[PDB]
Design a protein around this nucleic acid. Structure first.
Lengths: 98, 154, 50, 50
DNA sequence: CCCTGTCTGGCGTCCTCTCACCCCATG
DNA sequence: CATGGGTGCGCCAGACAGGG
């Protein structure tokens, strides 16, 4: 009933953090849809490295941001507070749309 | 000419009082002395003879008329009778939850688990009657949808 | 507090306060959409007696 | 009741230092209004004087 | 106004020990 | 399931009429 869309840069972190966000829900709400991954946005910035001439030495960079969905089933007040108010993992965005 | 009067019944048996009143009229056949019966108070179109007064108070589960005195009870001092019907109909049709959370306006939450929290309405939906406002939970503004009445304009 | 069975044996003051609040809510409703004088005189009189 | 003869915000929490249900189940923040429901955060005899 | 009759209120011992039973009713 | 509305006590005493 409530879309839980959460974003973070590390994949071993965003996917660790999705294990407890349903463990704090299935303990009380006892019904979640399931962990849905989403296609990651890879932003590339390839740019020069020398402070002058030699525009042939560049270094390819990439910042990968990931997205996960769990889309919890039950809108019972107990479950609502156990997710909305209880947000964990600093450095991990989580945004909810009921 | 038949003027209106107010009858008090045992509150809860009011439809049965109205039916028994119509039946007592058609028993004691004073048909020219009663016009209607409107529905804890029962409105009666009536005239005032002491016979019809004893008739209405001999109807069962009826306490008595409500007026200035019990000798000559009082017709209808309309002060807000029309206002009653008007406001009842208006509310029944629809309420008046003025879109409190407007696009780009801070709001206040007093309902659900987000009660006692403030936030801003990033998006508004007048068609869906829902305001998109996020409430700083553990610092993280938790974008949640609240109704106009569920939140107050800040 | 309830009794052995479980039904709550309620005090008399809760009946008195609950009556006064029921009548006061009815009288406020008889101030918004409201109703004629005889109605609000009986309503305020029932509140006075309550 | 939410706001009845036996309220939470108007008087106090039934349980000692417990706000209401899921809020404050230890001894650190005695006073915060439970985000879920309007309620005071005090002892058990606080309602007897209020 | 000065006495006379009426009308309502206020009150009547202290400790204990069991028992029984606490709002229908219903569209 | 919500809510909604008897007729056996007797004295004292002072306030309220009621004559007087």
């Amino acid at each position: 009933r409530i879309r839980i869309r959460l974003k973070a840069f590390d994949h071993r972190l965003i996917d660790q953090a999705t294990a407890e966000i349903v463990e704090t829900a299935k303990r009380t709400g006892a019904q979640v849809r399931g962990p849905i991954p989403l296609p990651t946005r890879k932003e590339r910035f390839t740019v020069l490295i020398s402070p002058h001439v030699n525009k042939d030495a560049r270094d390819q960079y990439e910042i990968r941001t990931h997205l996960r969905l769990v889309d919890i089933v039950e809108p019972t007040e107990k479950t609502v507070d156990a997710l909305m108010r209880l947000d964990l993992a600093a450095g991990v965005d989580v945004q909810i749309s009921l | 000419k038949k003027r209106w009067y107010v009858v008090q019944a045992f509150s809860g048996f009011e439809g049965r009082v109205a039916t028994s009143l119509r039946e007592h009229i058609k028993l004691h056949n004073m048909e020219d002395l009663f016009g209607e019966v409107m529905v804890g108070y029962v409105l009666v179109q009536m005239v005032m003879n002491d016979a019809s007064w004893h008739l209405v108070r001999s109807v069962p589960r009826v306490m008595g008329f409500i007026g200035g005195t019990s000798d000559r009870p009082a017709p209808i001092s309309d002060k807000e009778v029309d206002a009653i019907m008007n406001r009842l109909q208006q509310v029944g049709d629809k309420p008046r939850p003025k879109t409190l959370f407007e696009p780009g306006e801070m709001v206040r939450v007093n309902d659900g688990p987000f009660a006692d929290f403030n936030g801003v309405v990033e998006e508004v939906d007048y068609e869906k009657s829902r305001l998109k406002v996020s409430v700083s939970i553990f610092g993280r503004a938790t974008p949640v949808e609240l109704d106009f009445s569920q939140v107050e304009k800040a | 507090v309830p009794l052995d069975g479980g039904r709550f044996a309620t005090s008399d003051l809760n009946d008195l306060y609950r009556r006064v609040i029921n009548r006061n809510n009815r009288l406020k409703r008889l101030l918004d959409l409201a109703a004629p004088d005889i109605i609000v005189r009986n309503e305020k009189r029932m509140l006075q007696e309550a | 009741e939410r706001d009845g003869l036996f309220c939470a915000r108007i008087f106090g929490p039934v349980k000692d230092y417990e706000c209401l249900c899921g809020k404050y189940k230890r001894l650190k923040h005695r006073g915060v209004i439970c985000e879920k429901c309007g309620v005071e955060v005090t002892q058990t005899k606080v309602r007897r004087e209020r």
